[PDB]
């Protein structure tokens, strides 16, 4: 009974973790894809900065 | 490259 409770806790755990792992994996990929975009916005933000700053110059 | 590849680099 305890092993089955453990089967359920290690399996529920695995599923909770798979759910968490998936949430974190999606957040990982979401933040990674969005990081690339945030970096591209930084490149663009720096790019527009340079275009206007260069005009300033 | 070779340090990461091995002997697959023979014709070049």
């Amino acid at each position: 009974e305890e092993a089955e409770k453990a089967a359920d806790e290690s399996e529920r755990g695995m599923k909770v973790i798979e759910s968490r792992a998936q949430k974190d994996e999606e957040k990982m990929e979401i933040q990674e894809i969005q990081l690339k975009e945030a970096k591209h916005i930084a490149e663009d933000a720096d790019r527009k900065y340079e275009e206007v700053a260069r005009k300033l110059v | 490259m070779q340090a990461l590849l091995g002997a697959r680099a023979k014709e070049s």
């Binding site: 990674e32 894809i33 970096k39 | 697959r8 680099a9 014709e11 070049s12």
Partner: protein, 160 residues
């Protein structure tokens, strides 16, 4: 572009087939049929890695000559294949200066057209006045029809 074609004149294509084999081994890692920024990330952290980010963002934005804007599949492939070193003779300063003498036969540090035209005609191969149009855009960085040497240098530095 042209360089691609010369180097393939070195060796043959069955090679390319087995490359494709190596790559079925690799080609895991296209987000967009391209190997772009996130793909650089993916296939490189495949081992927890990414190129020296100068290389990486370089591929992201800059080496886009065409307006590809991104690391294409082609551009990540470009880095990964330009790996093994084979360029010849990259000719440069002291070369290009002694050359510049007869380039700027003017004896002036400012080439005229036809000295270069003579050199072009006497290289050993093909002078497209398309490419001469290129070279006027390039060589004379001043583009005043007369070229100070370093202009001609960067116009001629680093190539076979």
């Amino acid at each position: 572009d042209d360089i691609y074609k010369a180097a393939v004149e070195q060796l043959t294509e069955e090679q390319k087939n087995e490359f494709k084999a190596a790559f079925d081994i690799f080609v895991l890692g296209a987000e967009d049929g391209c190997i772009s920024t996130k793909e650089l990330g993916k296939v490189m952290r495949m081992l927890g890695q990414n190129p020296t980010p100068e290389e990486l963002q370089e591929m992201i934005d800059e080496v886009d000559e065409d307006g590809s804007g991104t690391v294409d599949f082609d551009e990540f492939l470009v880095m990964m294949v330009r790996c093994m070193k084979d360029d010849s003779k990259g000719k440069s300063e002291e070369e290009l200066s002694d050359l510049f003498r007869m380039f700027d036969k003017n004896a002036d540090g400012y080439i005229d057209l036809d000295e270069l035209k003579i050199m072009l005609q006497a290289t050993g191969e093909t002078i497209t006045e398309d490419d001469i149009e290129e070279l006027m855009k390039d060589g004379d960085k001043n583009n005043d029809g007369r070229i100070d040497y370093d202009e001609f240098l960067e116009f001629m530095k680093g190539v076979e």
